[PDB]
Amino acid sequence: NMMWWRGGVIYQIYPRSFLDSRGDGVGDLNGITEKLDYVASLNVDGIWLSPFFTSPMLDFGYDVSDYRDVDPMFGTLEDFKALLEKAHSLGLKVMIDQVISHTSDQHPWFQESRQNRTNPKADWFVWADPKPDGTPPNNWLSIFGGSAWTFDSRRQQYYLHNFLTSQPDVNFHHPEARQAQLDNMRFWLDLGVDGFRLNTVNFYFHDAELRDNPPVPKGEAKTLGAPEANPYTWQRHVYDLSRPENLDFLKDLRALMDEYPGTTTVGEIGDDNPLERMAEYTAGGDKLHMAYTFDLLNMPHSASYLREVIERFQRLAGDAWPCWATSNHDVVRSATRWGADEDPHAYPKVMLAVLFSLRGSVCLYQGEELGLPEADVPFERIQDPYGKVLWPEFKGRDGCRTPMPWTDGEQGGFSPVEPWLPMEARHLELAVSRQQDDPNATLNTVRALLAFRRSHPALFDGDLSLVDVGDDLLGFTRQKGDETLLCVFNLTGQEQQTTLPVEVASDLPVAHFTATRDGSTLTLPAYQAAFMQVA
Numbered sequence: 001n002m003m004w005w006r007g008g009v010i011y012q013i014y015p016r017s018f019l020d021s022r023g024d025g026v027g028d029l030n031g032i033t034e035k036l037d038y039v040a041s042l043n044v045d046g047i048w049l050s051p052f053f054t055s056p057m058l059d060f061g062y063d064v065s066d067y068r069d070v071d072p073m074f075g076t077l078e079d080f081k082a083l084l085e086k087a088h089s090l091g092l093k094v095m096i097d098q099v100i101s102h103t104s105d106q107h108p109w110f111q112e113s114r115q116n117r118t119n120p121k122a123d124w125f126v127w128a129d130p131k132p133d134g135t136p137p138n139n140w141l142s143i144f145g146g147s148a149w150t151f152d153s154r155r156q157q158y159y160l161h162n163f164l165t166s167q168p169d170v171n172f173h174h175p176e177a178r179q180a181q182l183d184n185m186r187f188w189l190d191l192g193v194d195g196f197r198l199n200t201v202n203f204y205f206h207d208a209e210l211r212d213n214p215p216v217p218k219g220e221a222k223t224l225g226a227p228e229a230n231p232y233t234w235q236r237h238v239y240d241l242s243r244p245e246n247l248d249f250l251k252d253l254r255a256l257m258d259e260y261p262g263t264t265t266v267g268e269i270g271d272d273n274p275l276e277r278m279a280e281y282t283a284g285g286d287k288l289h290m291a292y293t294f295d296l297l298n299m300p301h302s303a304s305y306l307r308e309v310i311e312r313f314q315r316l317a318g319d320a321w322p323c324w325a326t327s328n329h330d331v332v333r334s335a336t337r338w339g340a341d342e343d344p345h346a347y348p349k350v351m352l353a354v355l356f357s358l359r360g361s362v363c364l365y366q367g368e369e370l371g372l373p374e375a376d377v378p379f380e381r382i383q384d385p386y387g388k389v390l391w392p393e394f395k396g397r398d399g400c401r402t403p404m405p406w407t408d409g410e411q412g413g414f415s416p417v418e419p420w421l422p423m424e425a426r427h428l429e430l431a432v433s434r435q436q437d438d439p440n441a442t443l444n445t446v447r448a449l450l451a452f453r454r455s456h457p458a459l460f461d462g463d464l465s466l467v468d469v470g471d472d473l474l475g476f477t478r479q480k481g482d483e484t485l486l487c488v489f490n491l492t493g494q495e496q497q498t499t500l501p502v503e504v505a506s507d508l509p510v511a512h513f514t515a516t517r518d519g520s521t522l523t524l525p526a527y528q529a530a531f532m533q534v535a
């Protein structure tokens, strides 16, 4: 079963906010270990762990100072081995983050690199002389504010950083650095990890000519990976990322993965044309296994929009393979971002049904299975530095990083002390304990939907074909071998009706969904889904 990843569902855990088992108010590995039974009960195929490596935590894990160890705040390496072993014992695959695009400035490589222009690791990072006027070498901007270049007095040069100043980008034009990062991945592969989520996978290479980016002409759409309030979105990003050379490196990376059968990779795409880039990076079977984009991580969410996304993707390379996600640690929770103007109890069910019925892999964010709304984090409680640069137009990512509601008790049973982010009040009555034995609650809807998905080959990796189901409905067929299923979704809060584009063999009941099939006319109540066998 070495193709488990091609259609499998992965449960993303944000370590800081899952479960605190030691008592410092911050989630740790042992808590995850304690809740692997819960995770397994979701009928998901595996997990993706956000960074838990040694880090100053200035970007909370994504500024890595030691690629081959666990930060004391999350526990130890042995703790991780225990977590991995128990997870394997439950039939769960374990994937972990890899942030090889950039390191913390506290990483030994950079500490050495910054001292002078001639040291062994001087070229392991991206250094450039200032312009004659002492200004940055080009117009590249940091996503987290300011120029992408920061001056260092030691070398009298600027160093590049797409994100924080404390996150210098690695110079992938230096083969030994590439190799060092590959080795860093190999370290974790040798420990038995089942795969990697590749942080900003298209960022790896930059234009060595350091050419200026062109601006986006007024009225054209901005990039999906950043809020429009961010000046980052004022230029087309062609030279600061997504270079051709990266393809070659991807092959190398894939080669490493090939040395360990059954392992996989999912790339995070941050690009002006995310679908196209995902196709490019996941094509050939010699590069990325799969990748996800921000197309379903933004504001549009109509059935017509989904149709546009699916159509657009189907026009790309057919050998490509997508991973779909409606929520993660970087965006507003799906129940709020998409379903703010919808029923808070009904909409997450049909949304997640759509997510689970799309052709591709799935990323399911912690709490999304509870239909958790975006939390309101007060100014004085803000932790994410990305929330302190564009306030209040953009308030950062803390809203989706609030602690997991296990019980409706004190601090949601997350911690015996005050957690690093405040527990959201509204989450308490949506807690796991309050929701576990409720068959009408979103959790069990998710369980049933994923078991249902698991019982049908067509919903694993079957082909997808859009069909006419009306303007206010989303409809398509999934086909593999004997089995052809018709999937119809009502994402609206109003009853909808359509003529069936194919012939139904039998109705398929799943997760207490209600739909009326009268001959050739199908009716769907508000926020309902319909699955059917096709003759």
Ligand SMILES: OC[C@H]1O[C@@H](O)[C@H](O)[C@@H](O)[C@@H]1O
Pocket: 059, 062, 063, 099, 163, 199, 200, 268, 329, 330
């Ligand atoms: O590390 C810089 C940023 O890169 C993004 O791709 C990650 O998903 C974020 O969590 C992180 O803050």
Ligand SMILES: [Mg+2]
Pocket: 020, 021, 022, 023, 024, 025, 026, 027, 028, 073, 074
């Ligand atoms: Mg702890």
